[PDB]
Design a protein around this ligand. Structure first.
Ligand SMILES: Oc1cc(O)c2c(O)cc(O)cc2c1
Length: 411
């Protein structure tokens, strides 16, 4: 059956305990990364989240979640942190203001995980973005929003591609810098992957952070497989206009679902990218009935397959599965085209997207760079981040000081 189909075999039939309740999500999956200040709790503090978790656990919330009831639990804490930030900014305490705005943005973020599917989650997205950019503007090296005109947009698409932008100091047309284009995931948007930007700045590298179609503020048509292609044309046209960036040194790094888009654009925009990295991406079997019919109950904190269906613009999973084959980079002929430099990295035991899709990626077109991480699930952490930074440092001729860069990630 499905138990024989994929690399992980009958692991797909074992429901993960975190789906039983929020209590199990918190105790077995979220408390630890929150304490360490890492994804999905970048910029966050256990001091903020633990009191909120305790209130959710007392209420006994669990799948199926009422996303308005769920989101509202985070709001009193998010507002408290935003009020503290405002009073700090009024007093000229810039470093403190920045911290509490970003702590507020983290609480709003988790309130609209896994993706905004209710009015209060849609509200939390807007409120989280607002406090993130207030925090970002008060960083020593401010990260700014750029509303890139979507010149390549068609009917029914948004007029702009909102991105984060950070340019290292002394970057100029005379001394231009490489750019890491970060493509975000199904749940982590530009307000989350922002955590990478100061690291890249410290190594003399510009960053642009953009969301995938049907997430954050992406203007792209959800159901149209070619919508990302138009988005990257607008984004890369804008990066080329920034003369302080070397347009011959753009590296696209796709995180999780972002990996699919990084792999896709290595083909669609080969001549405009030095390299792309897919970290925990998929390509083909991520759209399989069998995979999607099992993934709701596996390592993903909530309902992966339903969330992916919503991101692709479908009202339910069955309707998505009916048409999902058309998004395959194999089915649509993408993987037959020439590609720029591609690095594929993932944990073998991934239960969000199958390692089988790294195999499909290596079974078609030109040879690609790969590191498989045995005995690890989605993203193959922490070794994956060291592998990728080492490769990008070598590619761009940076200082190779990847431990220094990685140490800047934990909040
Ligand atoms: O350690 C990480 C860091 C991330 O940025 C992740 C992300 O964006 C998506 C995901 O599914 C897992 C992640 C794990």
């Amino acid at each position: 059956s499905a138990t024989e189909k994929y690399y992980i075999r009958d692991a797909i039939t074992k429901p993960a305990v975190h789906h039983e309740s929020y209590q199990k999500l918190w105790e077995t999956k979220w408390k630890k990364p929150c304490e360490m200040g890492v994804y999905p709790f970048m910029f966050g503090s256990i001091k903020d989240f633990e009191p909120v978790a305790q209130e959710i656990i007392k209420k006994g919330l669990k799948e199926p979640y009422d996303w308005d009831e769920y989101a509202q639990m985070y709001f009193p804490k998010a507002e408290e942190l935003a009020k503290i930030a405002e009073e700090a900014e009024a007093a000229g305490e810039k470093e403190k203001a920045s911290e509490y705005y970003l702590r507020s943005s983290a609480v709003y973020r988790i309130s609209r995980f896994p993706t905004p599917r209710s009015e209060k989650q849609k509200y939390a997205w807007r409120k989280g973005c607002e406090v993130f950019y207030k925090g970002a503007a008060l960083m020593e090296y401010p990260i700014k929003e750029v509303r890139i005109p979507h010149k390549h947009g068609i009917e029914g698409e948004g007029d702009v591609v909102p991105v984060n932008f950070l340019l290292p100091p002394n970057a100029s047309e005379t001394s231009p810098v490489p750019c890491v284009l970060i493509i975000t995931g199904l749940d982590g948007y530009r307000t989350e992957l922002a955590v990478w930007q100061q690291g890249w700045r410290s190594k003399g590298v510009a960053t642009v952070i953009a969301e995938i179609p049907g997430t954050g503020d992406s203007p792209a048509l959800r159901q149209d497989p070619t919508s990302p292609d138009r988005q990257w044309s607008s984004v890369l046209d804008w990066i080329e206009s920034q003369k302080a960036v070397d347009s011959k040194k753009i590296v696209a790094w796709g995180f999780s679902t972002g990996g699919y888009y990084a792999l896709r654009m290595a083909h669609t925009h080969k001549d405009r990218l030095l390299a792309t990295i897919s970290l925990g991406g998929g390509a083909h079997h991520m759209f399989d009935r069998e995979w999607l019919e099992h993934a709701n109950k596996l390592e993903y904190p909530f309902d992966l397959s339903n969330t992916l269906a919503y991101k692709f613009g479908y009202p339910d999973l069955e309707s998505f599965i009916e048409e999902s084959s058309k998004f395959s980079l194999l089915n649509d002929g993408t993987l037959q085209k020439p590609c720029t430099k591609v690095l594929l990295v993932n944990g073998n035991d991934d239960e969000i997207f199958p390692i089988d899709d790294m195999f499909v990626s290596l079974e078609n077109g030109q040879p690609k760079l790969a590191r498989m991480v045995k005995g690890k699930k989605h993203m193959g952490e922490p070794e994956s981040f060291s592998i990728i930074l080492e490769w990008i440092h070598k590619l761009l001729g940076l200082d190779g000081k990847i431990k220094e860069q990685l140490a800047m990630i934990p909040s």
